Amino acid sequence: PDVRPVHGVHARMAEKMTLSHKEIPTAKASVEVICAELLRLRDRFVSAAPEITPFALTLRLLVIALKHNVILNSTWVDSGEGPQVHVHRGVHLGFGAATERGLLVPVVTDAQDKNTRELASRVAELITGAREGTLTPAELRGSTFTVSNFGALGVDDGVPVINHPEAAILGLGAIKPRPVVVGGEVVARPTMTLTCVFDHRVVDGAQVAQFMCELRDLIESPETALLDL
Amino acid sequence: PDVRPVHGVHARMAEKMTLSHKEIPTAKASVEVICAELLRLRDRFVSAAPEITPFALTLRLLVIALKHNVILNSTWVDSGEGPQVHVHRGVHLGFGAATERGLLVPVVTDAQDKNTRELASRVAELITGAREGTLTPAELRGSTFTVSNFGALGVDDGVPVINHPEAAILGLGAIKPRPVVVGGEVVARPTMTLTCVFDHRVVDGAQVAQFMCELRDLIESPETALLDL
Amino acid sequence: PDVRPVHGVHARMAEKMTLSHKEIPTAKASVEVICAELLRLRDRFVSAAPEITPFALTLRLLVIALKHNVILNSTWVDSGEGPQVHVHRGVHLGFGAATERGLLVPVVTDAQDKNTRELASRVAELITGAREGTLTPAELRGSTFTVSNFGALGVDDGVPVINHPEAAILGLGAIKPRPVVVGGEVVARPTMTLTCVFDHRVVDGAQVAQFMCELRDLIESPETALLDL
């Protein structure tokens, strides 16, 4: 066989993947989301601000949903005085950026303090930075929740691996036209499947469902929630 | 961070989740099921007996399918004289009931001996009991198979965790109108995705497929199988 | 309980399932594939060569995709000089064949060297051999990649277990008519969901997406790629 020694970003990925597999009892919950209004909103602003993308808007709405479902942004801890869940006050949002040198996971520090435009600009800088290889050590660490946008790569739905010691990860399926029922009629709509993989020690099914339903409802009516645009 | 010590129902969940993750090599099989006839049957009886719900009817049809696919209701055993599968004669059916105090898993003991009406009434008592916190220790133990109804919480499809030492768990996705093809035409129907997660030491793919196909076919033509109504 | 001692093909399955669960940090990626052209191509040749099946054509197109995405056909190795990925030059394609005596996994040795007709004939011999119990030890070993055709058993989508020490497995969902959008219209098409489960130490998300998108595109326009017919 062609023998490839593993180093760098591959070695660390391989390390991080093994740690998660070993420690975290996972479960998964998925919801189908209609993205017509999301893309309409994008169309409204993309000329004046090209960084307002469906991905950026989704991350903004995710931050809102995490502020309302705090248990999703947390860590299981056993060190010391018995079993504890540490619920994090800051949302430091990791997201995958696939590059020539492999995938990197830039982090939006204190995403909870950012308005839609602020978040969109920062995500754009981080996407650019990952691609050009100019990210600092601080921009590649400290996440409390992570997103995997395999949809941008053409995957319809997927099951990503929790970024240890986080309690959950969100996978974003591909946005494309699919058939859905609206007012009893079969119609075409842009849609996507969201899949949350979670540490079932930390988060229960009722909690994940509440989070995902909220996220779906924000994305399906984003204009009011993003009234800071 | 906000530090939450873990006790009670959370602590036991966290314990049960860890045990399953560690021991069970899982695989998953899903089938899409059309629920038009299921809801029609419900409509026929819900006035005189409000406990005949789609969930209750689904559990009844699940019991029938387990009686016909006995390997699904079993336990992997290594204690003693080598590897054994213990196939259980009784179907003691656990199901999730999410409550203020977390999720509980009431159990229908000897579900195999119950007719549709008997099962529906018992499920209703158990749902009430979980909500009001009046379940006995005996009503929270002894399951041989478990159902997770994340569909009632709005989740379209999901991957639940096997309730150790059981061999499989069934997830019930949300029932809602979705597009399907019937006689070559695209039509709206109420549908749901069923997902079975199974111990692949115990159950093989042919066995899970046979079980799930039977369950689908019962749900899609339930009137004859539930001729004890 | 009815106590069943475990031997033979069941015992080895149980062994292989446990090994995979313990070692491999998995992730999963799925794509929906339209199969209209695949079945049209089959119709063209099934009279003169009954072994040209949708399954055989899918495996042929899979081999092509693996030749172009070599990392999918590989093994994680830690023995010796640190972490290595061994990329295999031969594609020795395992596939599930469910039989009276359980499931067997016949192997097409050097599948990369076979033309469409050669592969189709060999797959047919191997299906026959598994059913009649006439396979040699050599025809049941040495795979570098494995396929699980749970679709033939009626399963719409599934999550199979990697055949250790392989880096990935492909699940083939059931081919049937489902609604899809084509040129903005909701239409009926035969479709299937492909699910790849992969060792995330070996393969990254960009690599799996590239593989799966290629496989989808081959299946959706197979006539040119199978111009050796």
Curated annotation (Swiss-Prot), chains A, B, C:
List keywords of the entry alphabetically: Acyltransferase, Lipoyl, Transferase
Q: How is the cofactor bound?
A: Binds 1 lipoyl cofactor covalently.
Span of the signal peptide: none
Spell out the GO cellular component terms annotated for this protein, sorted alphabetically and separated by semicolons: cytoplasm; peptidoglycan-based cell wall; plasma membrane
**Record's family?**
Belongs to the 2-oxoacid dehydrogenase family.
The role this protein plays is: Component of the branched-chain alpha-ketoacid dehydrogenase (BCKADH) complex, that catalyzes the overall conversion of branched-chain alpha-ketoacids to acyl-CoA and CO(2).
Q: What is this protein called?
A: Dihydrolipoyllysine-residue acyltransferase component of branched-chain alpha-ketoacid dehydrogenase complex
Q: Which organism is it from?
A: Mycobacterium tuberculosis (strain ATCC 25618 / H37Rv)
Q: Which gene encodes it?
A: bkdC
